[PDB]
Amino acid sequence: YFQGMISNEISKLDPLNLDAFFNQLPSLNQNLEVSLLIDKLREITKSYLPTTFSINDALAATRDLGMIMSSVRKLGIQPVSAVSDLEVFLETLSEITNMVPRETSYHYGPWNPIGERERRFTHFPDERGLIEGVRIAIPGIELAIREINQLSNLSLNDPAFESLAKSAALHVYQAVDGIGETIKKTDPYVFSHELRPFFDPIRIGGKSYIGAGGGQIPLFVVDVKLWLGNHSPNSEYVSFIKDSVFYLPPELRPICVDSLLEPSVINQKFAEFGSVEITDQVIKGMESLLSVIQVLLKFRKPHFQLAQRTLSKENRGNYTTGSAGYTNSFNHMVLEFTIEVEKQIRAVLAP
Ligand code: HEM
Ligand SMILES: N[C@@H](Cc1c[nH]c2ccccc12)C(=O)O
């Protein structure tokens, strides 16, 4: 009962009439023009009644208001503390979106218009590497989620299982396309120095909300359904996912929650494999699961490398963490998790 967060219906809206302002935002930020930032926040709280907004209006308004707030926070000022009327404006908006009162990578990517209206913090072309990265990744991962969700109720011997899993790996490849756009467009040093500071936490109604981040693409939702399940309860990754659930669009929360409380597909299919008549289609089915896992590795291995060149002493600037407060050890932990799964499947397929 959440369906219908359609990206092009949100990307096209300018509910707070900020299109002109966003063409100036990169120069406002370059020149440290905090006063114009505060003015615009003040103007917004007096110019609009957010209770009047449709759901799509509020999503797009969160995107735009969030990025102005992020630009204030960049300089070191908590924007809700400086503009106290924001707090009820952000309360009203999140009642409608049933999402956090802050922009996430959904707002920064798929819900961010292509072309002249594209919302950007800076004039640096490196910023386009992040935006295109998540704009490409997210719709593909979402498609993969719905496909992997259907694997639980299909038999390994059913060729519909193999086809579904193959569609999922192809959809996940969009995350691979996306990090490749980043690697080719975003210099690590420019990231740490020019872009990362727009992704810091903001205090809203007595709680801190992290900035938008690539880690907010719903890839962890693929992981929990596909291989993590309820199998590593006190793990660091489970704690990250736990902290991420209510950042997700509402439509994805049930899938994530159910999956954290259930055996994973691969654990379920490892049992069916070594307990039923192993046929040629059954091997294809099992091989389609290793295909998905191997596509996840084609994202995580170059991601780890880019994060390592960025967080090196040479390039890291004032930061040792991503927006969610972790170092590259966390990326190493997810990649080693995924490598272990690939190892296990290969071992089950060895004869
Ligand atoms: C210079 C660019 C980038 C750097 C330095 C970087 C670094 C990091 C770091 C340090 C984390 C740990 C979590 C955190 O602290 O927030 C993380 C998480 C993550 N980021 Fe990035 N990242 C970059 C670009 C991207 C892009 C463009 C995407 C998506 C298209 C992405 C996808 C992810 C994912 C999925 C995770 C969760 C871990 C996983 O699923 O393997 N990253 N990243
Ligand atoms: N993926 C990293 C770096 C990052 C920060 N903001 C982003 C926006 C888009 C893509 C990646 C990022 C993170 O989640 O912290």
Instruction: Encode 175-210 in three state secondary structure.
Output: HHHHHHHHHHHCCHHHHHHHHHHHCCCEEECCEEEC
Please give the CATH number for the structural domain made up of 132-348.
Answer: 1.20.58.480
Resolution stated for this PDB structure, in Å: 2.0
Within 10 angstroms of residue 258's Cβ, the number of other Cβ atoms is 12
Distance of alpha carbon 108 from alpha carbon 130, whole angstroms: 9
The verdict on the CB of residue 199 being under 6 Å from ligand 2 is: yes
First and final C-alpha spacing in the chain: 45
Residue ranges covered by each domain of the chain: 7-103, 132-348
Gap from CA of 195 to ligand 2 centroid (Å) = 9
Task: Give the position of tokens 């961010």.
Answer: 112
Give the tokens for residue 12.
Answer: 């096209």
CA 84: distance to chain centroid? 29
Tell me, which fold does domain 7-103 have in CATH?
Methane Monooxygenase Hydroxylase; Chain G, domain 1 (1.20.58)
For the chain, the farthest-separated pair of C-alpha atoms sits apart, in whole angstroms, at: 71
Distance of alpha carbon 67 from alpha carbon 195, whole angstroms: 12
Task: Give the position of tokens 């819900």.
Answer: 111
Nearest-atom number in ligand 2 for the CA of 212 is 6
DSSP for residue 209:
E
The verdict on the CB of residue 197 being under 6 Å from ligand 2 is: no
3-class secondary-structure state, position 122: coil
Q: What was the elucidation method? A: X-ray
Which ligand has the shortest distance to the CA of 177? 1
Nearest-atom number in ligand 2 for the CA of 322 is 15
In 3-state terms, the chain is what percent helix, strand and coil (to 5)? 70, 0, 30
Please check whether residue 297 is in contact with residue 335, taking contact to mean a CB–CB distance below 8 angstroms.
Answer: yes
